[PDB]
């Protein structure tokens, strides 16, 4: 069979290529948020915790991965730490992603209270807590859910390992029920599904809010039509009680538009509760000069912001769908290894490829920002032009 240093040299070189890009891309993210106070929101503190976990993939997890494919003689628990450190960092990224979905959900659903609820100080406390939980979850095998107690000793003597040592291989020290049940199903897959729901709720609340907005608009204008085209005084009253309510509704330079608007409706309602039909129909035309000059322009900045929230949460959902794509192959292969012991194990080369793919996720997030977030892309250019 072919000398394995040939296939390894390829896998290593690829891994190092990827570590290089991971560091750069994600240092630039971080340098970006540091420098551009437009990018200094709570949402982006999570983006930074995400970029830092990806820098750490290049600086550490990927060298660890290179190390543990050699099979080098190593004390079992030390081999377990270099095997598990990547699980810690990946768990950090799930928490950061979930935090971002939730943040964006709070932002669209209770925009009024978002500044007072989601503050820079609570964000940073959540980030710290999640990093501690990621170390706990990711290094749980250290605490005894491992295969250290049953070393492959024929394989350790074949390699001259010291007494106390193992060939340091991932599938030899980390149990596959840990990886399938605990790490995949419960600590990755369940969080992804969750993140998937949150984003459904965001797109629904935006879809609904925009609906309400353009409904209200049409109440405003159809009740005007009812008024031009009545010839009876209690018709006009009925249509202005409705206009009025549909105005204190949409309420919740801006306010002088609704001040005027409800005022003119209070003017015209009052004519109409006197029987002056024509006097009130031409009073309820004064509204139209007020819609044209104020209400249409609140309609429109409010639609603008919702379309911006929607587009932002699609950008962020793409970050989560690419996480899924990069990591799923590897889990899906572990599922086969574990659930079908009748099946031949996936070949070495594919293991290599699933692992490499999982690591490329540490290169995608920076490209996403740059293609999808005008403020990150403008800031990427300033840094790239001024320094290179
Ligand atoms: C601040 C950063 C750079 C610290 C990096 C520390 C890393 C490189 C260290 C910390 C703990 C170390 C491990 C501790 C124990 C063992 C068992 C031994 O039989 C082989 C080496 C091995 C597997 C070590 C490899 C290197 C290691 C993972
Ligand atoms: C998320 C997207 C990209 C889908 C991922 C599909 C990949 C991971 C799937 C599709 C077909 C799968 C293979 C189908 C059959 C076998 C034979 C078995 O003896 C070992 C596992 C192995 C080799 C599977 C490994 C995982 C596999 C390659
Ligand atoms: C949305 C999707 C990607 C969620 C995850 C799907 C996973 C859990 C599913 C998709 C395909 C499934 C595999 C399909 C075929 C086999 C072969 C059988 O002998 C053991 C179960 C096993 C190995 C399944 C395990 C679970 C599996 C890997
Ligand atoms: C080695 C492993 C990882 C490197 C960690 C990188 C840590 C990133 C620090 C940069 C930072 O705080 O910038 C964002 C702030 O400006 C937000 O207000
Ligand atoms: C040594 C092992 C390294 C671990 C990963 C390093 C993680 C360091 C934490 C990064 C998260 C971060 O910086 O979040 C703060 C945010 O910017 C608020 O302003
Ligand atoms: C910035 C910081 C740089 C990041 C750290 C880089 C590499 C860590 C991985 C190195 C682990 C190598 C262990 C090899 C070993 O111990 O091999 C002995 C064995 O007994 C057979 O000789
Ligand atoms: C959520 C998806 C969970 C998918 C769960 C897949 C379970 C597969 C299974 O139970 O496989 C049994 C097999 O017979 C073992 O030998
Ligand atoms: N599974 C799994 C798994 C595995 N069997 N091997 C390795 S490295 C040994 C090796 N390198 C090339 C061929 N074999 C790694 C790593 N890192 C994982 C792994 C596990 C969880 C992750 O979040 C990321 C990666
Ligand atoms: C996905 C990202 C880019 C993929 C690059 C190609 C994958 C890197 C190494 C996979 C092939 C390594 C082994 C080649 C065959 C020889 C062998 O397996 O021993
Ligand atoms: C800095 C980047 C370093 C990258 C990888 C270091 C890999 C160490 C290889 C383990 C030694 C193999 C052995 O002794 O059998
Ligand atoms: C910046 C710090 C760089 C840290 C050192 C990097 C990699 C060390 C490579 C480990 C070599 C193992 C030798 C194995 C052996 O000789 O048997």
Swiss-Prot record:
GO BP of this protein: adenylate cyclase-activating G protein-coupled receptor signaling pathway; adenylate cyclase-modulating G protein-coupled receptor signaling pathway; apoptotic process; apoptotic signaling pathway; astrocyte activation; blood circulation; blood coagulation; cell-cell signaling
TM region positions: 10-34, 45-68, 80-102, 123-145, 176-200, 316-339, 348-371
Membrane protein topology class: Multi-pass membrane protein
Annotated adenosine binding sites: 171, 334, 358-359
One of the record's GO molecular function terms: protein-containing complex binding
Cytoplasmic side: 35-44, 103-122, 201-315
Residue positions with a glycan: 156
Disulfide bonds: 73-161, 76-148, 79-168, 340-343
UniProtKB keywords: Cell membrane, Disulfide bond, G-protein coupled receptor, Glycoprotein, Membrane, Receptor, Transducer, Transmembrane, Transmembrane helix, Ubl conjugation
Keyword Plastid found: no
PTMs per UniProt: Ubiquitinated. Deubiquitinated by USP4; leading to stabilization and expression at the cell surface.
Chief location category: membrane
Family: Belongs to the G-protein coupled receptor 1 family.
UniProt domain comment: The cytoplasmic C-terminal domain is necessary for targeting the non-ubiquitinated form of this protein to the cell surface.
Reported function: Receptor for adenosine. The activity of this receptor is mediated by G proteins which activate adenylyl cyclase.
Oligomeric and partner information: Interacts (via cytoplasmic C-terminal domain) with USP4; the interaction is direct. May interact with DRD4. Interacts with NECAB2. Interacts (via cytoplasmic C-terminal domain) with GAS2L2; interaction enhances receptor-mediated adenylyl cyclase activity.
UniProt protein name: Adenosine receptor A2a
Organism: Homo sapiens (Human)
Gene that encodes it: ADORA2A
Portion of the full-length sequence here: 2 to 307 of 412
């Amino acid at each position: 069979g072919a000398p394995p240093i040939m296939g390894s040299s390829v896998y290593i070189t690829v891994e190092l290529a990827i570590a290089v890009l991971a560091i750069l891309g994600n240092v630039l993210v971080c340098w970006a948020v540091w420098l551009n106070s437009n990018l200094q929101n709570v949402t982006n503190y999570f983006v930074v915790s995400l970029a830092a976990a990806d820098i750490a993939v290049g600086v550490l997890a990927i060298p660890f991965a290179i190390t543990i494919s050699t099979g080098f003689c190593a004390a079992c628990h030390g081999c377990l730490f270099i095997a598990c450190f990547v699980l810690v960092l990946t768990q950090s990224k799930i928490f950061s992603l979930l935090a971002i979905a939730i943040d964006r959900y709070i932002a669209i659903r209770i925009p009024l209270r978002y500044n007072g609820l989601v503050t820079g100080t609570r964000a940073k406390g959540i980030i710290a807590i999640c990093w501690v939980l990621s170390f706990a979850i990711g290094l749980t095998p250290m605490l005894g859910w491992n295969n250290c107690g049953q070393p492959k000793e024929g394989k350790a003597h074949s390699q001259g390992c010291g007494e106390g040592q193992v060939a340091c291989l991932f599938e030899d020290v980390v149990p596959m029920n840990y990886m399938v049940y605990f790490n995949f199903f419960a600590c990755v897959l369940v969080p992804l599904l969750l993140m998937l729901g949150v984003y459904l709720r965001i797109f629904l609340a935006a879809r609904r809010q925009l609906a309400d907005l353009e409904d209200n608009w049409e109440t405003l204008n159809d009740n005007l039509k009812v008024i031009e085209k009545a010839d009876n005084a209690a018709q006009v009253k009925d249509a202005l009680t409705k206009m009025r309510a549909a105005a204190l509704d949409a309420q919740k330079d801006f306010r002088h538009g609704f001040d005027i608007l409800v005022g003119q409706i209070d003017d015209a309602l009052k004519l109409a509760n006197e029987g002056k039909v024509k006097e009130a129909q031409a009073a309820a035309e004064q509204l139209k000069t007020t819609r044209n000059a104020y209400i249409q322009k609140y309609l429109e900045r409010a639609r603008s912001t919702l379309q911006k929230e929607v587009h932002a949460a699609k950008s962020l959902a793409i970050i989560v769908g690419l996480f899924a794509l990069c990591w799923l192959p590897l889990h899906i292969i572990n599922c086969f290894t574990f659930f079908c012991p009748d099946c031949s194990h996936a070949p070495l080369w594919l293991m290599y490829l699933a692992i490499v793919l999982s690591h490329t996720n540490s290169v995608v997030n920076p490209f996403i920002y740059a293609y999808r977030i005008r403020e990150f892309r403008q800031t990427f250019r300033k840094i790239i032009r001024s320094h290179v």
